[model samples]
Target: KSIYEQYLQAKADNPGKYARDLATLMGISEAELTHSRVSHDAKRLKGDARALLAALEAVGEVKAITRNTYAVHEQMGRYENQHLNGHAGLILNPRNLDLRLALNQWASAFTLTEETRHGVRHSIQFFDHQGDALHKVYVTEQTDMPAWEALLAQFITTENPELQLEPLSAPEVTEPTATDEAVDAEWRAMTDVHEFAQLLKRNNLTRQQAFRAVGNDLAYQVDNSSLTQLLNIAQQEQNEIMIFVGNRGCVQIFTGMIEKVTPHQDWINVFNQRFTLHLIETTIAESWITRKPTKDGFVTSLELFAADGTQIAQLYGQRTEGQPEQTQWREQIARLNNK
Candidate 1:
C-alpha cells in the first residue's frame, strides 16, 4: 500500500496514536505540534497531489525517528529509608502519614500540563541509596517537578522547628514524651523476645535458655507467659517492614515520623493540605530511584525509602500487566535511565 494510504488506515484504526504518529512523521515535537501549522503546499499535496504526496510521505515517514525521551530529568532531591538496613528507629505515627504528606506537597508546588495528567497520578516510589526496595505514596493530583524540588528542601533538613510546617518530621526529631517513652521502652523490650523466638528456629538453644534470655531482657517481669505474644508485639514494633501495595502496585513504602495528625471531614482536603507539602520535599528521592532503575519491569516491584530509613511506598510500572517480557524490560529501563 502507498504510505499515505497506510497512514490514513492507521489513523482510522486508532485516532490518538495515529495523531501522535502523524505529528512525528511531520518532523514535529509533540509540544511544538500543538501550535504547528501545516504548509499550504503540504496541505494541497495531502488533499490532491496524490503521486508526489505518496513519494514525499514515504521518505518523511521513514526519516522521522520517535525518540522515547523522558519528560523530566535533573536531580530534584533525596531521602533515606534507614530501617531497610537494620537501623532501629521509632514509629511514632502511622507509617503512611509522612509519605502522604510528601506527595501532596509535591503536587501542589508543581503544575502538570493536562496532557501529562492523562495517566499520571500524584504518586511516588521511594528507594534507598543502593537502589533497594522501600515504600510508596500516592497523592491526589498532578505536580510540577521544579516546584516540588523547592518544597522538598524544608522536609529534608534537620531543623526541628519546621516540624509543624511539615508534620511528618516530628516523630523523627522530637523526643518522645515521658509516657510515650515508657511505652516505647516496652516496645523495645519485645525485640529481645523476637530474638529468642528466632533462636528456637534452630533448636540450638534450649527453651530454658530462651526463657532465661527473655526473662533477663524483661527482668523476669512476666514468667510463664506466651512468648508468641511477646514476639507478635515485637514484630509489630521493631522489624524492618515493607508495604508494597497501592494503585496497581506502582507505589512503594518509605518511613517518615509523624510530626502531627489532623483529622478532617474530607480525606481529599486533608491530603491536599497535609500530605502534598512533604511530598515535594521527598521527590528528590524518587529522582534518585529513577536514575537507579530505568526499566519499567525491574522497577515494577521497586519501593521508595524515607529520610529516617523507613519503607514508605512501592513503585511499579504505569502499565503493570500484559507488558513485554524481560528483554523489553531491559530496553525500556535503559531508555529511561539514559534519557
Candidate 2:
C-alpha cells in the first residue's frame, strides 16, 4: 500500500485532532493513518482485554469512549463496578455502558501521544485485524495521572510501529436454517426479555432475523424521519434512555436523561455532562418499536438498523435490576410508532 505524503504533512495542518480525522479528509480508514504514528513515538502494545480493565480499575477514573463509523458514545466514569463473569469475552457490564464484547475480533492495540496546536493528545486505541477501531479511551482532566503513568508502563507490550495491514473479508453466503413460524413461536413464547438471547439460540435466529420474524405488531419497522425525532422526544420528556454504540470488541452505553439534543449536518447528538452520542442520520435504513413481554411489563425499544440490516443503535427507557419499567416510558415509546 502506498502511503499518502499529504496526510503526513497535514498532521501540522489539522492542528490538534487525532489521525482518524485527517484520514477521513483524505478518504481512508483511521487505522491506515494512525499506523503511521506508530513510527512517530506511538506504542504498539499487545492487546490484553483483562489487563485493560485492570488498568482502568486501578486508574480509578478516565473518560471512556467507544464508537463505530456512525455513532460515537462517551462517558466520563470510573471502571469501578466491572464484574468480569461469563466469557468476559462478551463484556456484560449492564449497569451504565452495557458492553457486549467479541474480543477475538481485536488482535492489536496501540497507544499514541501527540502534541498539537490545541494541546497534548493521548489515547489508548484498539483495532481489528483489518485495522478498524473496536473501541477508544481518552485521557480527561479528572483522569488519575499517577495511575495513568503506571498503566503506561504496565501495559506497554511493544515499541514496534510497523503494522500488518489487510482489507476486510467478504461475508459468507448462508441460510437461516429455520422457519418463520418456528422462530415466531419461540420469540412470542418468551416471558422474560433476558431469555431473548437463549430464544434466538433455540430457533437459530440473529437479533435482526428474530425482529423480522415478529414484524408489524411485535417489531414495527419505521423510517429515519422519526428516528431523529426520538432523540428530541427523549430530551423533551427528560426520559431516561439507554444508548448502545460499539464495534466487534465493545458496546458503550449511555443511561439517564439526554439533556441537550443537537445536530451537526448528517449527524445527531446528545452530548452533555458525562455522556455523548454521535449518531449518523444518513446510515439509518430501518427503525423498529421492538416489544417483548417481561415479568414486570412489556419492554419496548427503538432499534435502528443500517442498510445491510446491521443494528446501528438501540434506545430504551432506563430501568435497573429488580425495578419496574419507567411509568412514562411505555406511553413514550408508544408515540414513536406509525408517526
Candidate 3:
C-alpha cells in the first residue's frame, strides 16, 4: 500500500486520535503525516515564517496554539506588535497573545482545512526542521476571514509539496567531564536567571543536569502532581502567575490569575475566557522547583519536563520586571517545596 493509503488506514483504525499522537503511533513525524494529505485537505505554505507572522496582524482575533508533546497552550486573541529580527521574535504586548519564538528553528508550514461536525475549520501550522510543530493559528468567530484568505494566498506555495525532514538526533552518550562542584560554583555566583542558560552552555550540561548539580538549595524534584496543588494555592490566594509553554519554535505565555481549574481524567487544565492551558499530568516525567537570584531578589519557578529531557512547561509567579518577586508568590511555592 502507498504511504497515503497507510495513513488513511491508520486514521480509520484509530478513531478520535490527535494528528500528533497518530503520527507517533504510525512512527512518522507529524509534518510527514501533514504532507501526505497535500492537495487534498492540506496545502504547503511558502515564504519565511516572519512574513507569515507579520501578515497575521491583519487577520484580527484568532486562536494561537503552541505545545510540546505533553502540554498544549492555547490563547484566543490577535497577533500584533511583532518583533522579528531573523534570530528571535517576540510579541510582548499586554494583549492576550504573547510569544517568544526561536525563529531560526522554523522550517516548513502548511494550511489545513477539515470538515467537522459543526463546520469547516481553517488553520495554518508551522514546523521545525525536525518536523515538530512550532505554532499554529486557527480562524475563530472573531477572525477576519477575508484577511485570512488573502494572507494564505500571499504565502501559499506554487512548488512541489514534498518534504525533506531531518532525523531527531540522539543524546550524546559520553559523560560530561564538568564536575558537580564546578557547575554549582557558577550557579551560586549568578546574579540573574537568564545567566543560567549561559552557565549550562559553559558547563555543557542539560537544564536538569545543572539543576541536580546545584544541590537542593537551588533546585529539587517535586511530585508530578505538584502543579495541581500549586495552582489551587494560587487560586485560593488570588495569586497572579505566569505559565510558559513552548516547543523548539515558539513559547506562549499566560499571565494573570487563573479563574478556574478543571481536572478531566489524566489531564489538568485551566479554562478561562482568554487563556487556557491543557497539561497531561500522567505524561509529566519530572517536576522541579528551581530558584535563581536577580538584582531585585531571587525568582523561583516550577519546571516540568518529559522523560526524554525536553521541557514541557514552566510556572512562575507573575511580578513586575526589576521588582522583587512578590512575597505572596514565594510563600505559595514554599508550600509546594515544604510538601
Specify the highest-lDDT model's number: 3
Pairs of residues at least 3 apart in sequence or in different chains that clash in candidate 3:
none
Residue-level lDDT for 188 in candidate 3: 77
Better of 1 and 3 by TM-score: 3
Predict model 1's lDDT versus the native: 0.26
Q: Write the per-residue lDDT of candidate 2 for residues 1-339, one digit (tens) a residue.
A: 345576766767887655667887767667766666565657776566656765677765567778777778887767655555424444344544456666666657778787766799777887776777877777888778788878878787655555566666634433577788777776677778878878776666667778787746778776576667778887898878888776666777777887898888888888788788888889888777888877666678888878887668888788776676786877766666473
Candidate 1 residues 1-339, lDDT tens each? 644455456557766573345646644332223222122001101111112112221111111111111111111112222121122221112333211111222111111122233564332222222221123223233334444434333222222121112223222333222343343243344322234334344334333233233322222222211211222332344422222222211132323222232222311010112222112122212211221122222232233333433333332222323442234322332333211
Global fold similarity of model 1 (TM-score): 0.19
Q: What are the per-residue Cα lDDT tens digits for candidate 3 across 1-339?
A: 866687888889998888888888888888888888787898888858888889999999999999987889989888897888756779875538999988888888899999988899999999888888899998899999999999988888857456777776645653656899888888878888879988877777888888888878889988888899888888788778999998877989888888889899989999888888899888888899988888888899999988888898999987776788888988887777442
Task: Count residue pairs with overlapping backbones in model 2.
Answer: 0
Candidates' lDDT values, in order? 0.26, 0.72, 0.85
> In model 2, which runs have C-alpha deviations exceeding 4 angstroms?
1-6, 9-18, 21-29, 85-98, 161-174, 201-206, 337-339
When sorted by TM-score, best at the front, the candidate numbers are 3, 2, 1
Question: Looking at model 2, which ten-residue stretch has the lowest summed lDDT?
Answer: 84-93
